[PDB]
PDB file of C-alpha atoms and ligand atoms in Angstrom:
ATOM      1  CA  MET A   1      57.259 105.753  83.360  1.00 34.69           C
ATOM      2  CA  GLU A   2      57.221 102.310  85.238  1.00 32.16           C
ATOM      3  CA  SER A   3      61.121 103.654  85.854  1.00 31.46           C
ATOM      4  CA  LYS A   4      63.007 106.475  84.588  1.00 29.07           C
ATOM      5  CA  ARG A   5      65.975 104.261  84.786  1.00 28.84           C
ATOM      6  CA  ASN A   6      64.787 101.975  82.053  1.00 28.37           C
ATOM      7  CA  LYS A   7      64.736 104.963  79.344  1.00 29.61           C
ATOM      8  CA  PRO A   8      67.695 105.366  77.372  1.00 31.28           C
ATOM      9  CA  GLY A   9      70.294 107.950  77.557  1.00 32.46           C
ATOM     10  CA  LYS A  10      73.949 108.742  76.952  1.00 33.80           C
ATOM     11  CA  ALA A  11      76.517 108.942  79.730  1.00 33.98           C
ATOM     12  CA  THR A  12      77.927 112.120  80.268  1.00 32.91           C
ATOM     13  CA  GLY A  13      79.970 113.990  83.202  1.00 30.77           C
ATOM     14  CA  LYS A  14      83.945 113.891  84.144  1.00 33.43           C
ATOM     15  CA  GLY A  15      83.915 111.562  87.361  1.00 34.26           C
ATOM     16  CA  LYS A  16      87.032 112.513  89.567  1.00 34.58           C
ATOM     17  CA  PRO A  17      90.529 111.129  89.875  1.00 32.67           C
ATOM     18  CA  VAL A  18      90.669 108.385  92.492  1.00 33.21           C
ATOM     19  CA  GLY A  19      93.706 106.064  93.765  1.00 38.98           C
ATOM     20  CA  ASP A  20      94.358 102.923  95.550  1.00 36.95           C
ATOM     21  CA  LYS A  21      91.552 103.399  98.399  1.00 36.73           C
ATOM     22  CA  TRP A  22      88.346 103.981  95.693  1.00 38.73           C
ATOM     23  CA  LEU A  23      86.221 101.176  96.653  1.00 41.11           C
ATOM     24  CA  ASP A  24      87.257 101.869 100.523  1.00 42.87           C
ATOM     25  CA  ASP A  25      85.601 105.352 100.064  1.00 43.15           C
ATOM     26  CA  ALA A  26      82.514 103.577  98.837  1.00 43.54           C
ATOM     27  CA  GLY A  27      81.941 102.826 102.611  1.00 45.83           C
ATOM     28  CA  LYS A  28      81.990 106.407 103.688  1.00 42.90           C
ATOM     29  CA  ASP A  29      80.158 109.602 103.368  1.00 45.84           C
ATOM     30  CA  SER A  30      78.374 110.109 100.177  1.00 46.38           C
ATOM     31  CA  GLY A  31      80.087 107.191  98.404  1.00 47.76           C
ATOM     32  CA  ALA A  32      83.233 106.997  95.884  1.00 50.89           C
ATOM     33  CA  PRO A  33      83.078 108.869  92.816  1.00 48.59           C
ATOM     34  CA  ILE A  34      83.180 107.227  89.381  1.00 49.82           C
ATOM     35  CA  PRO A  35      86.757 107.665  88.501  1.00 50.31           C
ATOM     36  CA  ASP A  36      87.653 109.993  85.703  1.00 51.56           C
ATOM     37  CA  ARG A  37      88.795 107.267  83.694  1.00 52.39           C
ATOM     38  CA  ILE A  38      85.810 105.221  83.491  1.00 52.11           C
ATOM     39  CA  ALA A  39      83.883 108.458  82.446  1.00 54.90           C
ATOM     40  CA  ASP A  40      86.327 109.035  79.743  1.00 54.36           C
ATOM     41  CA  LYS A  41      85.568 105.681  78.536  1.00 54.29           C
ATOM     42  CA  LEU A  42      81.572 105.775  78.788  1.00 54.04           C
ATOM     43  CA  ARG A  43      81.045 109.239  78.156  1.00 54.31           C
ATOM     44  CA  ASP A  44      78.822 109.933  74.994  1.00 54.18           C
ATOM     45  CA  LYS A  45      77.744 106.105  74.835  1.00 57.25           C
ATOM     46  CA  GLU A  46      74.247 105.677  74.877  1.00 57.63           C
ATOM     47  CA  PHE A  47      72.652 103.035  77.295  1.00 57.30           C
ATOM     48  CA  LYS A  48      69.049 101.589  76.878  1.00 59.32           C
ATOM     49  CA  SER A  49      69.048 101.369  80.848  1.00 58.65           C
ATOM     50  CA  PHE A  50      70.601 102.377  83.941  1.00 55.73           C
ATOM     51  CA  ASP A  51      71.084  98.149  84.695  1.00 53.43           C
ATOM     52  CA  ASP A  52      72.961  98.601  81.320  1.00 50.31           C
ATOM     53  CA  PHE A  53      75.048 101.326  82.242  1.00 53.86           C
ATOM     54  CA  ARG A  54      75.897  99.610  85.469  1.00 55.05           C
ATOM     55  CA  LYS A  55      77.058  96.406  83.570  1.00 55.90           C
ATOM     56  CA  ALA A  56      79.306  98.890  81.458  1.00 54.61           C
ATOM     57  CA  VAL A  57      80.914 100.449  84.284  1.00 58.13           C
ATOM     58  CA  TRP A  58      81.955  96.977  85.949  1.00 59.34           C
ATOM     59  CA  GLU A  59      83.195  95.833  82.758  1.00 57.75           C
ATOM     60  CA  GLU A  60      85.566  98.815  82.436  1.00 55.84           C
ATOM     61  CA  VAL A  61      86.665  98.358  85.990  1.00 56.95           C
ATOM     62  CA  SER A  62      87.888  94.980  85.245  1.00 57.93           C
ATOM     63  CA  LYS A  63      89.502  96.158  82.365  1.00 57.76           C
ATOM     64  CA  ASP A  64      91.589  99.117  84.562  1.00 55.13           C
ATOM     65  CA  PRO A  65      94.842  98.138  86.284  1.00 56.37           C
ATOM     66  CA  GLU A  66      94.548 100.648  88.838  1.00 55.66           C
ATOM     67  CA  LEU A  67      91.039 100.134  89.849  1.00 57.57           C
ATOM     68  CA  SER A  68      91.286  96.592  89.285  1.00 60.16           C
ATOM     69  CA  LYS A  69      94.581  95.553  90.891  1.00 57.94           C
ATOM     70  CA  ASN A  70      93.285  94.782  94.277  1.00 56.01           C
ATOM     71  CA  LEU A  71      90.066  93.263  93.649  1.00 54.65           C
ATOM     72  CA  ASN A  72      91.087  89.576  94.323  1.00 54.73           C
ATOM     73  CA  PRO A  73      90.797  87.082  91.434  1.00 57.37           C
ATOM     74  CA  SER A  74      87.231  86.102  92.432  1.00 57.29           C
ATOM     75  CA  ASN A  75      86.034  89.529  92.465  1.00 58.70           C
ATOM     76  CA  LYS A  76      88.100  90.051  88.846  1.00 58.33           C
ATOM     77  CA  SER A  77      86.410  87.196  87.585  1.00 60.95           C
ATOM     78  CA  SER A  78      82.927  88.708  88.740  1.00 58.87           C
ATOM     79  CA  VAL A  79      83.447  92.251  87.547  1.00 57.88           C
ATOM     80  CA  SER A  80      84.963  90.543  84.184  1.00 59.45           C
ATOM     81  CA  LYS A  81      81.129  89.606  83.543  1.00 61.41           C
ATOM     82  CA  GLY A  82      79.834  93.001  84.161  1.00 60.51           C
ATOM     83  CA  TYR A  83      78.726  91.973  87.787  1.00 61.75           C
ATOM     84  CA  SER A  84      78.960  94.193  90.872  1.00 62.12           C
ATOM     85  CA  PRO A  85      81.958  93.085  92.703  1.00 62.64           C
ATOM     86  CA  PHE A  86      81.323  91.842  96.196  1.00 61.03           C
ATOM     87  CA  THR A  87      81.843  94.013  99.031  1.00 63.58           C
ATOM     88  CA  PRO A  88      83.558  92.999 102.401  1.00 61.44           C
ATOM     89  CA  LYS A  89      81.172  91.220 104.924  1.00 59.29           C
ATOM     90  CA  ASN A  90      81.292  93.987 107.346  1.00 60.19           C
ATOM     91  CA  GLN A  91      79.513  96.032 104.506  1.00 62.23           C
ATOM     92  CA  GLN A  92      77.059  93.793 103.466  1.00 64.06           C
ATOM     93  CA  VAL A  93      73.075  93.930 104.629  1.00 63.02           C
ATOM     94  CA  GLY A  94      71.035  90.749 103.814  1.00 66.47           C
ATOM     95  CA  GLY A  95      71.205  89.760 100.692  1.00 69.15           C
ATOM     96  CA  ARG A  96      72.921  93.146  99.475  1.00 66.25           C
ATOM     97  CA  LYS A  97      76.326  92.072  98.966  1.00 64.58           C
ATOM     98  CA  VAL A  98      77.880  93.900  96.177  1.00 64.12           C
ATOM     99  CA  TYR A  99      78.964  97.685  95.693  1.00 62.31           C
ATOM    100  CA  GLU A 100      75.903  99.562  94.712  1.00 60.15           C
ATOM    101  CA  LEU A 101      75.726 102.883  92.204  1.00 58.28           C
ATOM    102  CA  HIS A 102      73.650 105.178  93.869  1.00 59.45           C
ATOM    103  CA  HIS A 103      72.445 108.983  92.581  1.00 60.02           C
ATOM    104  CA  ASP A 104      73.551 111.719  94.912  1.00 56.90           C
ATOM    105  CA  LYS A 105      70.318 113.877  93.675  1.00 53.08           C
ATOM    106  CA  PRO A 106      67.510 111.279  93.645  1.00 52.66           C
ATOM    107  CA  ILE A 107      66.132 110.513  90.046  1.00 52.81           C
ATOM    108  CA  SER A 108      62.745 110.711  91.596  1.00 50.48           C
ATOM    109  CA  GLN A 109      63.545 114.516  92.573  1.00 48.15           C
ATOM    110  CA  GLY A 110      65.205 115.306  89.163  1.00 48.70           C
ATOM    111  CA  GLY A 111      68.512 114.211  89.332  1.00 50.02           C
ATOM    112  CA  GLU A 112      69.895 112.764  86.145  1.00 49.10           C
ATOM    113  CA  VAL A 113      70.329 108.728  85.430  1.00 47.43           C
ATOM    114  CA  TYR A 114      73.302 108.611  83.342  1.00 49.69           C
ATOM    115  CA  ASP A 115      75.105 111.856  84.512  1.00 46.90           C
ATOM    116  CA  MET A 116      78.249 110.321  86.037  1.00 48.25           C
ATOM    117  CA  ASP A 117      79.059 113.256  88.364  1.00 48.43           C
ATOM    118  CA  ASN A 118      75.505 112.486  89.964  1.00 47.07           C
ATOM    119  CA  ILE A 119      76.650 108.779  90.425  1.00 43.24           C
ATOM    120  CA  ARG A 120      78.464 107.482  93.253  1.00 45.05           C
ATOM    121  CA  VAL A 121      79.872 103.899  94.269  1.00 43.52           C
ATOM    122  CA  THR A 122      78.560 102.810  97.881  1.00 46.21           C
ATOM    123  CA  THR A 123      78.523  99.586  99.838  1.00 45.39           C
ATOM    124  CA  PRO A 124      75.184  98.187 100.728  1.00 47.91           C
ATOM    125  CA  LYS A 125      75.817  99.403 104.508  1.00 50.29           C
ATOM    126  CA  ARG A 126      76.485 102.941 103.335  1.00 54.09           C
ATOM    127  CA  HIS A 127      73.829 103.205 100.487  1.00 56.51           C
ATOM    128  CA  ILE A 128      71.145 102.659 103.367  1.00 61.82           C
ATOM    129  CA  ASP A 129      73.011 105.025 106.018  1.00 60.25           C
ATOM    130  CA  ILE A 130      73.226 107.609 103.275  1.00 59.15           C
ATOM    131  CA  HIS A 131      69.459 107.677 103.177  1.00 59.25           C
TER     132      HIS A 131
ATOM    133  CA  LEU B   1      73.400  68.376  96.788  1.00 58.28           C
ATOM    134  CA  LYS B   2      73.458  71.093  99.599  1.00 58.50           C
ATOM    135  CA  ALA B   3      71.764  70.847 102.673  1.00 59.62           C
ATOM    136  CA  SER B   4      74.860  71.461 105.207  1.00 60.00           C
ATOM    137  CA  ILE B   5      78.628  71.056 104.444  1.00 56.60           C
ATOM    138  CA  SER B   6      78.265  67.405 105.408  1.00 59.69           C
ATOM    139  CA  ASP B   7      76.185  66.373 102.350  1.00 58.49           C
ATOM    140  CA  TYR B   8      79.295  67.522 100.304  1.00 59.19           C
ATOM    141  CA  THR B   9      82.087  65.332  99.389  1.00 60.00           C
ATOM    142  CA  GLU B  10      85.473  67.670  99.527  1.00 60.45           C
ATOM    143  CA  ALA B  11      85.458  67.060  95.619  1.00 57.58           C
ATOM    144  CA  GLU B  12      81.909  68.326  95.218  1.00 59.99           C
ATOM    145  CA  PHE B  13      82.726  71.493  97.777  1.00 57.12           C
ATOM    146  CA  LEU B  14      85.869  72.162  95.648  1.00 55.31           C
ATOM    147  CA  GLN B  15      83.607  72.054  92.442  1.00 48.55           C
ATOM    148  CA  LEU B  16      81.138  74.680  93.937  1.00 45.64           C
ATOM    149  CA  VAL B  17      83.962  76.831  95.393  1.00 44.70           C
ATOM    150  CA  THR B  18      85.662  76.833  91.668  1.00 44.82           C
ATOM    151  CA  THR B  19      82.327  77.906  90.062  1.00 45.81           C
ATOM    152  CA  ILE B  20      82.304  81.110  92.512  1.00 50.79           C
ATOM    153  CA  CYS B  21      85.986  81.873  92.126  1.00 48.94           C
ATOM    154  CA  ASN B  22      85.295  81.962  88.496  1.00 48.03           C
ATOM    155  CA  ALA B  23      81.721  83.459  88.531  1.00 46.07           C
ATOM    156  CA  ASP B  24      80.652  80.630  86.257  1.00 44.06           C
ATOM    157  CA  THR B  25      77.087  81.785  86.220  1.00 43.09           C
ATOM    158  CA  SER B  26      74.337  83.267  83.972  1.00 42.56           C
ATOM    159  CA  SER B  27      73.582  86.175  86.179  1.00 39.56           C
ATOM    160  CA  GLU B  28      74.625  88.158  89.354  1.00 38.99           C
ATOM    161  CA  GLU B  29      71.997  86.996  91.236  1.00 37.56           C
ATOM    162  CA  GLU B  30      72.901  83.297  90.604  1.00 37.91           C
ATOM    163  CA  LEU B  31      76.590  84.215  91.547  1.00 40.94           C
ATOM    164  CA  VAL B  32      74.861  85.933  95.034  1.00 40.94           C
ATOM    165  CA  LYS B  33      72.912  82.980  95.680  1.00 39.42           C
ATOM    166  CA  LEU B  34      76.101  80.605  95.400  1.00 40.19           C
ATOM    167  CA  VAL B  35      78.008  82.966  97.650  1.00 39.14           C
ATOM    168  CA  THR B  36      75.278  82.896 100.094  1.00 38.49           C
ATOM    169  CA  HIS B  37      74.846  79.274  99.937  1.00 41.39           C
ATOM    170  CA  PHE B  38      78.475  78.750 100.716  1.00 41.76           C
ATOM    171  CA  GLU B  39      78.659  80.763 103.711  1.00 40.61           C
ATOM    172  CA  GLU B  40      75.453  79.030 104.956  1.00 42.45           C
ATOM    173  CA  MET B  41      77.763  75.642 104.422  1.00 42.13           C
ATOM    174  CA  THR B  42      80.691  76.687 105.952  1.00 46.84           C
ATOM    175  CA  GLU B  43      79.102  78.668 108.976  1.00 45.58           C
ATOM    176  CA  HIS B  44      82.370  80.653 108.864  1.00 51.96           C
ATOM    177  CA  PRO B  45      82.506  84.025 110.671  1.00 52.50           C
ATOM    178  CA  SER B  46      83.959  85.713 107.706  1.00 51.21           C
ATOM    179  CA  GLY B  47      81.398  84.835 105.374  1.00 53.82           C
ATOM    180  CA  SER B  48      82.261  85.736 101.733  1.00 50.55           C
ATOM    181  CA  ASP B  49      85.424  87.482 102.958  1.00 50.53           C
ATOM    182  CA  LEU B  50      86.894  83.763 102.447  1.00 46.46           C
ATOM    183  CA  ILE B  51      86.575  84.025  99.140  1.00 45.20           C
ATOM    184  CA  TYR B  52      87.053  87.826  98.185  1.00 43.15           C
ATOM    185  CA  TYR B  53      89.193  89.160 100.987  1.00 41.52           C
ATOM    186  CA  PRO B  54      91.489  86.766 102.134  1.00 42.37           C
ATOM    187  CA  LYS B  55      93.846  87.100 104.987  1.00 40.59           C
ATOM    188  CA  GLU B  56      97.474  87.980 104.225  1.00 42.02           C
ATOM    189  CA  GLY B  57      99.373  84.720 102.875  1.00 40.23           C
ATOM    190  CA  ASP B  58      95.949  82.837 102.713  1.00 39.42           C
ATOM    191  CA  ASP B  59      95.780  80.730  99.542  1.00 39.82           C
ATOM    192  CA  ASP B  60      92.519  82.204  98.040  1.00 40.45           C
ATOM    193  CA  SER B  61      92.599  79.724  95.024  1.00 37.84           C
ATOM    194  CA  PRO B  62      89.946  77.364  94.734  1.00 37.18           C
ATOM    195  CA  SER B  63      91.675  74.517  96.583  1.00 34.13           C
ATOM    196  CA  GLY B  64      93.067  77.012  99.229  1.00 30.37           C
ATOM    197  CA  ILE B  65      89.602  78.010  99.944  1.00 29.88           C
ATOM    198  CA  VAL B  66      88.338  74.388 100.718  1.00 31.01           C
ATOM    199  CA  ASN B  67      91.484  73.696 102.693  1.00 28.35           C
ATOM    200  CA  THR B  68      90.946  76.795 105.009  1.00 28.71           C
ATOM    201  CA  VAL B  69      87.347  76.105 105.345  1.00 28.12           C
ATOM    202  CA  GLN B  70      88.245  72.293 105.997  1.00 29.12           C
ATOM    203  CA  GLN B  71      90.788  73.021 108.701  1.00 30.47           C
ATOM    204  CA  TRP B  72      88.451  75.639 110.714  1.00 30.61           C
ATOM    205  CA  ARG B  73      85.327  73.388 110.807  1.00 28.39           C
ATOM    206  CA  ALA B  74      87.958  70.737 112.151  1.00 27.43           C
ATOM    207  CA  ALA B  75      89.394  73.106 114.387  1.00 29.13           C
ATOM    208  CA  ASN B  76      85.718  74.475 115.667  1.00 31.69           C
ATOM    209  CA  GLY B  77      84.315  71.149 116.458  1.00 32.42           C
ATOM    210  CA  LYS B  78      81.846  71.036 113.422  1.00 31.32           C
ATOM    211  CA  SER B  79      80.888  67.951 111.248  1.00 32.34           C
ATOM    212  CA  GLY B  80      83.364  67.685 107.804  1.00 30.97           C
ATOM    213  CA  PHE B  81      82.807  66.768 104.409  1.00 30.85           C
ATOM    214  CA  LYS B  82      80.772  63.495 103.436  1.00 28.35           C
ATOM    215  CA  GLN B  83      82.453  60.226 103.776  1.00 26.36           C
TER     216      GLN B  83
HETATM  217 NI1   NI C   1      70.541 106.109  96.339  1.00 25.35          NI
END
């Protein structure tokens, strides 16, 4: 009401195992899953808005060796502030140059905002093609 | 400050690149806007890959980035840094 994304909620869901190519998958299919390791850290926390949740996800990836190893130093500095990291140029579209959190079942169709099993990491090129 | 790379001295461009690399900004938007500006200034085909997805063996340190830009512009017939 204005936006369902700005209403507080708790993160739920398991996410899925991911490996060294995790962000590579954000550029294919329906995007890459939220890693099971991030979910374990955010599960049950209360967020005031989805933006807030999104900043938490990126701070968590910054502190995670597997997920963070290879993000170059300049992307590490960005996610350490809680910003979404930059995608490779070929996946950027216009002013959309960072990884985007997409809801597999749209929120406007009843999909859950903070259910991490409904959340996918996507590049701006794949988010628009997955639409 | 910033119309084209020729308005930048090499020191000042190194300042801009150091800020981007450290994400020394107040919001994601400001960072995005700096990286956009950088691309516009360099005119390099790789865009923001010079900062975030460098080539194998390329020095992606700030000075490293400025050298890469400096050498590409020179080699491509474009104007360089101010002075
Ligand atoms: Ni979406």
